[PDB]
């Protein structure tokens, strides 16, 4: 049941990896993976009904 993931190696001395095994039945007990996703800001930065083309007039 071992999970093997890679580290993003910052300062250097191949891919360096690390190992994780969950010891508990409840996912609440698990550490955080930090393997997170990003998304586009659009729902906040461009919430407009008609798609904005930045080279065009915002108002036409």
């Amino acid at each position: 049941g071992a999970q093997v993931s890679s580290q993003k190696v910052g300062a250097h001395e191949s891919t360096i990896n690390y190992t994780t095994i969950n010891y508990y039945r409840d996912s609440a007990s698990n550490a955080a993976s930090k393997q997170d996703f990003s998304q586009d800001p659009s729902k906040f930065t461009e919430p407009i009904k008609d798609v904005l083309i930045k080279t065009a007039p915002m108002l036409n």
């Binding site: 049941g1 071992a2 993931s5």
Partner: peptide
């Protein structure tokens, strides 16, 4: 066994 990401 082992998962790999």
């Amino acid at each position: 066994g082992s998962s790999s990401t």
